[PDB]
Amino acid sequence: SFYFPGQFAFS
Amino acid sequence: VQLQESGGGLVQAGGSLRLSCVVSGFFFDTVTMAWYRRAPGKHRELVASATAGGTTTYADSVKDRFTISRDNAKNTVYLQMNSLKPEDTAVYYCNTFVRSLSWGQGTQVTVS
Amino acid sequence: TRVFKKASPNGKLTVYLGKRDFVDHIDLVDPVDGVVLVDPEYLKERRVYVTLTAAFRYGREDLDVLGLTFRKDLFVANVQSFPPPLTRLQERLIKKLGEHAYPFTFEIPPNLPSSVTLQPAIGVDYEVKAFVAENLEEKIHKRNSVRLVIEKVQYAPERPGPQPTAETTRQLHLEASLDKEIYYHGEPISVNVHVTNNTNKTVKKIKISVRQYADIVLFNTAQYKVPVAMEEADDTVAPSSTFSKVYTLTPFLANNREKRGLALDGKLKHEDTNLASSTLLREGANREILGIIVSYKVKVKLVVSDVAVELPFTLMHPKPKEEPPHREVPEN
Amino acid sequence: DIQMTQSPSSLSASVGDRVTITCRASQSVSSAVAWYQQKPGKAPKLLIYSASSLYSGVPSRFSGSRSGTDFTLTISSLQPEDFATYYCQQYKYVPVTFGQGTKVEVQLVESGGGLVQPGGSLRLSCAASGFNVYSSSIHWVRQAPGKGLEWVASISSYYGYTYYADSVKGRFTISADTSKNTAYLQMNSLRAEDTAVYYCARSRQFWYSGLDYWGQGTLVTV
Amino acid sequence: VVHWVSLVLYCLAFVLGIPGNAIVIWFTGFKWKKTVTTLWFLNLAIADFIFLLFLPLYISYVAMNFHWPFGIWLCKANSFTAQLNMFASVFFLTVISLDHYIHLIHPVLSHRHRTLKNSLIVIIFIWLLASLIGGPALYFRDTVEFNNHTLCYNNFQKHDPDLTLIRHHVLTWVKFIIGYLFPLLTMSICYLCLIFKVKKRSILISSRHFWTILVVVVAFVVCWTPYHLFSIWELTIHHNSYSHHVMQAGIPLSTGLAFLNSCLNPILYVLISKKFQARFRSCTTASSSLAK
């Protein structure tokens, strides 16, 4: 919804 | 591996020669060094063994006549001559029992 | 007779062999007759035996990538020289060295590749290793062993073969034929190029090459080809003509040093040898039995502006007179 | 290097005698020892090519044996066609040296040779027939007048190897034409000590077994 | 619980990878065997060494509870070098597998590409490909500042939002296909066919090879499946209008497993039985007589 995974887990 | 040696000479009969054979190069370790005599026109024949411990064997035609003493501390071996025979003359060589050393020039003895 | 001996780096455990050459007949291989010598001491507490490994390296630098030693043993036979018949050579060794001489004899089975190497090591090489070990399976140090290397070679048979012929036609009835089937090393090769041109197309030049097939098989059959010689001509034929001429070729190593993958005879040391001799296999029974197989086939090609033929032949050494030294006679 | 010496410098015998010629090598060479017989005015002929193996053509009377380094040649009976000079050669190393000579009391043709001033140049053409250059080894051996044989140079076309003697290195070059099956020797800066009879000898390229065939003679005087 | 084990994994991977890569980088000091097969390991070692040099930044990232300090000054280059090193490493592994297969099945090999010049050319080409595929990671990143922590993430919402629903799908799917699917598939097709498919069992050596192939495959799969599978599943469920809540909480564990794989590659690949002897570090034939 609001950066719940934040499209960030690694590069 | 020079295997320098000396002790040859001319003896009439029953004289001591006291041949000397020195070893330079590889360590003596606990190997046995033999003594081979080459008769004129014949091949080399085993004479003594001189093992690490005291276990010395002679040949059939030389038993109770020769005597080998080993001084591996200075890397030297010797043969004792007693009551020689006219047929004992030969070019004596000094080499390991398994003949693992290069055959250098051997001393020449003559019995008259 | 001047038998061959190789003393170990250790002060004992020497090995005597009559000759460092064992031929491989089409029927049976000569036994590896010899006597291993050892002092009475240092043996009573262990057991002495001699191995014979048919090693086969197929890599470089002896790389061990992913546990791949690049080597292969084709025939390993171990005989226990420790006391539980003998030939003339074996019994002569016993009476000379003395009582403490232990004979050892192997038996190489047929259908085994000969000792052939490749020019850069890769190639088939044999070895006779003698060492003493009671367990008969424990690791042995390099200094307490003899790395006596032997080689097995094949020689040309007395009976010759028929003249090779090929008649590959294409729409040019080419008909090539060699002088003889049996060719010795370093000898000229003469091939006929008798052709018959009938079409309007005209050939440009005639290319003749001799290629060596190193039929190495480890996982899949390989057909490496090395053009050891080339005799590119400039002759040509018009319609309704011919160019029958006896071209002469001679394979050698002076101009083939730069070529890679070239097959040569077994090398005991870094001393160089000639091209690998052709290997003979049993008729019908020949199959994928591993190792390296060397064959020679000439090729005549017509460049029209192609017709190619193959004529197999055998390139082998003759029967030696006394013994092969297996080294550069005028060395250094 | 290795020097080859013969014990008897002059042997005198009669017809129907057993004579022994002793030749001792300086170093410990293998059985690779060859014996030659040189008639006066003729090229040397090989007798034994392995110090124990009889050649094909020589009578069975000649025999050889070795012990350490004691290579010797024995003749059962001296026929009138036997008195010549005998040389012992070792071919285990490149600097092959012949014996001093013992006095008893396939065609190769060469061209060229003549009076040349010192420092000049001369070429010798060794016309070879009956064999292949790739399957044989070509060697050049000179012989000073009345003295022993001396090796000059050799060529091995199969392996592309050329060997020259220490006294003729650089000044002498050797070449062979495969198409014409000939051997050529070119000389540069001819010194005053090079007056000798030059022989173009042949040996088997594969498993060298002595100089089977020799030349005729093209003695050059400077 | 996942955070502590992940941090221990990062620490162990760095500590065992710095010297492990350093020792194999020099190739026993100066021998270095300038051959293609040996150059594979050297290039892999230097790539993994760069990866390990840039690892401690991500170590602080995970440790500080996503509190990444710097913006475009650090993460904009960190992302690019991480993708470059990781994809170069996986490409090195797959080309090593392909090269091993081709020189082991033994066809005519020296004619096609088995030359030093071709090795250099293909190394330059593969490095350029890795740089190109790591390209858009460098030039597409935002640094949001939430709850006293700055996250360097992707910036598809920035620039032009005119793009359709497919925004991250293409790049992630390409990475899954090129980078995971092709190398893993070709490694399987090579090793399983060669080893597991019992082809010519007579010469299928049961020595260290038969076990090392399997351990390499199992390490690769166990250390590369988590990251790609989790990323794909998370992206799918997030874009399928679910918002994912907080259900994974353990994605840095996948990165730790990848770091452990990068640690294990140089030690297991090069430091082997023969190399152990190198790391730890006759006579002449005569002749006798015989009675006639």
DSSP 8-state secondary structure symbol assigned to residue B87? G
Cα–Cα–Cα angle for E283, E284, E287, nearest 5°? 130
Cβ-proximal residues to D87 (8 Å cutoff; 6+ apart), any chain: D35, D36, D38, D44, D98, D99, D101, D102, D148, D149
Q: How many residue pairs bridge chain B and chain C with CB atoms within 8 Å of each other?
A: 43
Please report the residues numbered 47 through 86 in chain B whose beta carbons come closer than 8 angstroms to any beta carbon of chain C: 49, 51-53, 55
Q: What are phi and psi of E111, to 5 degrees?
A: -75, -35
> Closest approach of chain B CAs to the CA of C14, in angstroms?
6
Cβ-proximal residues to D156 (8 Å cutoff; 6+ apart), any chain: D137, D162, D205
Resolution in angstroms comes to 3.2
Strands D197-204 and D149-156: unpaired
Distance of CA B108 to the CA centre of its chain: 11
Indicate yes or no: CB of E154 within 8 angstroms of CB of A1: no
- Closest-CA residue of C relative to E292 is C1
- Contact list in C for residue D207 (CB cut-off 8 A) is 320, 324-325, 329
Tokens representing B53?
A: 């411990």
Please report the residues numbered 3 through 32 in chain B whose beta carbons come closer than 8 angstroms to any beta carbon of chain C: 26, 29-32
Q: What is the dihedral of CA E217, E220, E221, E224, to 10 degrees?
A: -170
Spatial separation of the C-alpha atoms in residues C113 and C214, rounded to whole Å: 12
Spatial separation of the C-alpha atoms in residues C143 and C323, rounded to whole Å: 30
Spatial separation of the C-alpha atoms in residues C174 and C196, rounded to whole Å: 6
Strands B76-81 and D85-90: unpaired
Strands D19-25 and D33-38: unpaired
Place of tokens 């790609």: E228
Indicate yes or no: CB of C40 within 8 angstroms of CB of B49: yes
Any CB–CB contact under 8 A between E203 and chain C? yes
Spatial separation of the C-alpha atoms in residues C195 and C176, rounded to whole Å: 8
DSSP 8-state secondary structure symbol assigned to residue C230? E
Instruction: Kindly list the strands in the beta sheet with D45-48, ordered across the sheet, starting from the edge strand earlier in the chain.
Output: D10-11, D102-104, D85-90, D33-38, D45-48
Q: What are phi and psi of E218, to 5 degrees?
A: -70, -40
- For residue B51, give the nearest of C14, C38, C41 by CB distance: C41
Side-chain half-sphere of D74: how many Cα atoms within 13 Å?
8
- Contact list in D for residue C325 (CB cut-off 8 A) is 30, 32, 207
Cβ-proximal residues to B53 (8 Å cutoff; 6+ apart), any chain: C41
* Contact by Cβ (8 Å): C23, C30: yes
- The strand pairing partners of C56, in sequence order, are C124
Spatial separation of the C-alpha atoms in residues C51 and D213, rounded to whole Å: 45
Q: What is the dihedral of CA C87, C88, C92, C93, to 10 degrees?
A: -40
* Contact by Cβ (8 Å): D21, D47: no
* Contact by Cβ (8 Å): C290, C72: yes
Alpha-carbon Rg for chain C in angstroms: 25
CB atoms within 10 A of CB E73: 10
* Contact by Cβ (8 Å): D155, D175: yes
Cα–Cα nearest to C192, from C210, C208, C207, C177: C177
Q: Which of C4, C153, C249, C252 should one mutate to test binding to chain D, selecting the residue with the greatest count of D CBs within 10 A?
A: C252
Indicate yes or no: CB of E286 within 8 angstroms of CB of B44: no
Cα–Cα–Cα angle for E142, E146, E149, nearest 5°? 85
* Contact by Cβ (8 Å): D157, D203: no
Indicate yes or no: CB of A8 within 8 angstroms of CB of E153: yes
Q: What is the separation, in whole angstroms, between the first and last Cα of chain C? A: 26
Indicate yes or no: CB of D132 within 8 angstroms of CB of C250: yes
Side-chain half-sphere of C54: how many Cα atoms within 13 Å?
18
- For residue C325, give the nearest of D94, D159, D207 by CB distance: D207
User: Letter for the amino acid at C119?
Assistant: Q
Spatial separation of the C-alpha atoms in residues C213 and C296, rounded to whole Å: 6
Cα–Cα nearest to C171, from C310, C311, C302, C299: C302
* C-alpha separations of D154 from B37, C124, D34, D160, D184 in Å: 43, 33, 17, 11, 11
Spatial separation of the C-alpha atoms in residues B76 and B5, rounded to whole Å: 9
Indicate yes or no: CB of C218 within 8 angstroms of CB of E106: yes
